[PDB]
Structure formats: structure tokens, C-alpha cells
Amino acid sequence: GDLINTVRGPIPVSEAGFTLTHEHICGSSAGFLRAWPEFFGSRKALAEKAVRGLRHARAAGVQTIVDVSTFDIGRDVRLLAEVSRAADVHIVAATGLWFDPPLSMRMRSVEELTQFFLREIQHGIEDTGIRAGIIKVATTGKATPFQELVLRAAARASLATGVPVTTHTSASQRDGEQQAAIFESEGLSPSRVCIGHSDDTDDLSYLTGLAARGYLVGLDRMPYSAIGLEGNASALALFGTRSWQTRALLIKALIDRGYKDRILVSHDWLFGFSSYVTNIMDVMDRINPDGMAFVPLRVIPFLREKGVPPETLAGVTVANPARFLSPT
Numbered sequence: 001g002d003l004i005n006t007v008r009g010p011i012p013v014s015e016a017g018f019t020l021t022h023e024h025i026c027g028s029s030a031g032f033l034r035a036w037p038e039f040f041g042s043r044k045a046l047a048e049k050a051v052r053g054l055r056h057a058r059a060a061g062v063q064t065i066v067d068v069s070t071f072d073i074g075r076d077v078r079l080l081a082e083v084s085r086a087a088d089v090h091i092v093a094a095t096g097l098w099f100d101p102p103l104s105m106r107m108r109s110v111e112e113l114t115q116f117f118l119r120e121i122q123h124g125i126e127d128t129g130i131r132a133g134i135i136k137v138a139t140t141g142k143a144t145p146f147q148e149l150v151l152r153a154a155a156r157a158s159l160a161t162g163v164p165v166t167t168h169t170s171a172s173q174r175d176g177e178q179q180a181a182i183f184e185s186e187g188l189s190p191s192r193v194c195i196g197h198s199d200d201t202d203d204l205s206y207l208t209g210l211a212a213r214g215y216l217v218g219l220d221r222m223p224y225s226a227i228g229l230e231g232n233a234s235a236l237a238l239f240g241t242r243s244w245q246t247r248a249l250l251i252k253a254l255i256d257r258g259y260k261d262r263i264l265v266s267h268d269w270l271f272g273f274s275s276y277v278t279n280i281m282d283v284m285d286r287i288n289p290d291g292m293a294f295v296p297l298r299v300i301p302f303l304r305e306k307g308v309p310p311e312t313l314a315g316v317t318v319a320n321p322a323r324f325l326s327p328t
């Protein structure tokens with residue numbers, strides 16, 4: 001009965017299946033893929049790489065990913081549609097703004113930002129008619145004044161449409177608490193909200209505090225680790241020094257504390273990556289050759305071997321996303 005918008009059109013919520021809720025086809029910038037496709041080798045190479053990756057994830061049991069690339073992550077919805085078709089993996093596109101908005105966005109009011117997010121949800125992205133099924137926002141510490149607007153506009157667009165809101169945080173600085181306060185001041189239900197990059201900290205007081213309030217807790221950087229790369233400053237800074245097993249243990253920690261229905265798991269992976277150092281993609285592909293299959297291939301069995309019941313693992317990877325993505 002319930003429907004979610006994908007880049008290939010509407011699908012029944014029940015067909016979303018095993019869903020990775022924070023992923024990217026390509027992490028880039030507005031206009032960039034159009035202006036400088038050679039940065040990625042070519043558009044064709046980038047698409048082929050993405051299709052091979054999503055097919056690998058599909059073979060591992062992934063049926064849907066949520067591509068949380070916003071306008072300013074250089075989201076290219078035609079690219080998403082082409083790769084979703086070729087790999088036969090659903091992709092839900094995002095609206096919202098991440099932490100690289102250009103001046104034409106930064107100068108906008110909360111009202112004007114709301115109109116923009118609503119356009120992408122209700123009318124379509126660009127001239128494509130492809131509708132966004134989630135709203136992505138971001139802080140990196142205390143919200144800037146503009147980021148406050150963005151979080152408010154995201155709350156208002158969500159209330160209007162029922163589409164959920166997902167966040168980038170600096171987890172170590174406990175951004176979720178301020179994001180939560182702002183969302184609740186707009187009257188948004190915490191069940192419509194996922195506080196992302198929450199596996200970047202082992203602070204369970206912070207994480208259980210959010211979960212107790214009804215937030216979804218996004219443990220979405222599973223394969224990120226610079227262990228063994230500590231001499232590569234840019235890898236260290238982005239990936240951290242905690243192992244994937246350390247990250248995965250948080251899933252179990254939250255389940256053991258009664259919060260199984262409040263967890264979303266993902267990789268934050270990508271197949272192209274121009275908003276960071278050059279050749280960062282090669283470093284990542286060495287760290288995690290399995291790409292977006294890493295969760296089903298490594299994380300889920302690790303949890304199973306620690307005694308997490310299959311029904312609980314299914315609730316986390318299928319029922320939680322379905323509940324989150326269903327417009328409510």
C-alpha cells in the first residue's frame with residue numbers, strides 16, 4: 001500500500017528489502033561531473049564502476065540504497081537512474097544541503113530553502129521529474145547560522161511531505177543533541193529523523209540519549225578505518241583509527257540496550273570521490289574491496305556470530321529502513 005520514490009519511479013515500501021540508508025554513487029560538487037567528467041576517467045567509466053559495485057552489493061542481498069548526495073554533493077540524478085537500471089538495485093535520491101553550499105544557497109531564507117526542498121520532493125529534481133525520497137542536512141560542530149536555517153527548512157519540508165530527514169554529524173562533538181533540539185522546536189517527530197555518522201563515536205551516553213527520544217541512530221560508516229595507513233594523513237583524518245569490528249559492536253550495544261528498532265546501518269561508500277584528495281578512491285578501494293557488499297558479507301555475520309538473532313538482524317536491515325522511508 002505504502003510507496004517510496006526512487007530514481008526509477010515509485011516502488012511499494014515492501015519491495016525495498018535489505019536497504020543501505022546512507023550511501024553515494026559519487027561524492028562530488030554541484031556542476032562538477034558535467035564540467036570535468038575526466039576527473040573520474042570519464043562519466044562512462046564512473047557509471048561502469050558504479051554498476052559493478054551495486055551488482056556486487058545486489059549479489060550479497062542488498063536490494064535498495066539511499067543515495068544521500070544533495071545538490072552540493074553534486075548529485076546527478078540521471079547518473080543514479082542509469083546505474084540503478086543497469087544494476088537492478090533501487091536508489092532513493094535526496095534533497096537538502098550538506099556542508100558545501102554555494103553562495104546562491106547560503107544567501108537563502110528558511111522560507112526559500114523550504115520551497116527548494118519541496119520542489120525536489122514534490123515536483124522533481126532539475127527537469128527530470130525524479131522525486132527525492134529523503135532530506136539530507138549537515139553540521140560539523142555547532143551549526144552555523146545558515147545550517148540552522150537548513151535544519152528548519154528540512155523539518156518543515158518533512159512535515160509537509162512525510163519524507164524523513166537524515167544528518168551528517170561530527171559525532172565526536174555530539175552534534176545530534178543540537179540537531180534534535182532544532183528539529184523538535186519545529187515540531188518534527190524524532191521517528192522521522194536519523195542522526196548520521198553515529199558510529200564515528202563510542203559515546204553510548206550520547207547515542208542512547210538520542211535513541212531513548214525516538215531518533216534513528218545512523219551507524220553508517222562501517223568499513224571506515226585507517227588502521228595500517230596511519231602515515232597517510234588524509235586517510236587518517238577521514239577514516240579514523242577504530243576498526244570496523246569496533247564500529248559493528250555499536251550495533252550490538254544498542255540492540256543489547258533495547259534499541260534494535262532505532263538503528264540504521266550503512267557504509268557511506270561511493271564509487272567516485274572528487275570533494276577530497278585526489279586518488280582517495282584508490283585508497284578506499286584497497287581498504288574495502290567489497291564496497292557496498294561489506295555490510296552483508298562481514299558485518300551481518302559478525303553480529304550473527306556474537307549471537308544476534310536473525311529476526312533482529314532482519315528488523316535492522318529491512319523493517320527499520322522501511323519504517324523510516326515510508327512517508328509518515
Ligand SMILES: CCOP(O)(=S)OCC
Pocket residue numbers: 024026027028073168238268275
Ligand atoms: C567519506 C564520505 O563522507 P560524507 O558522508 S561527509 O560524504 C562525502 C561526500
Ligand SMILES: [Co+2]
Pocket residue numbers: 168169197
Ligand atoms: Co557525511
Ligand SMILES: [Fe+2]
Pocket residue numbers: 022023024068268
Ligand atoms: Fe555521506
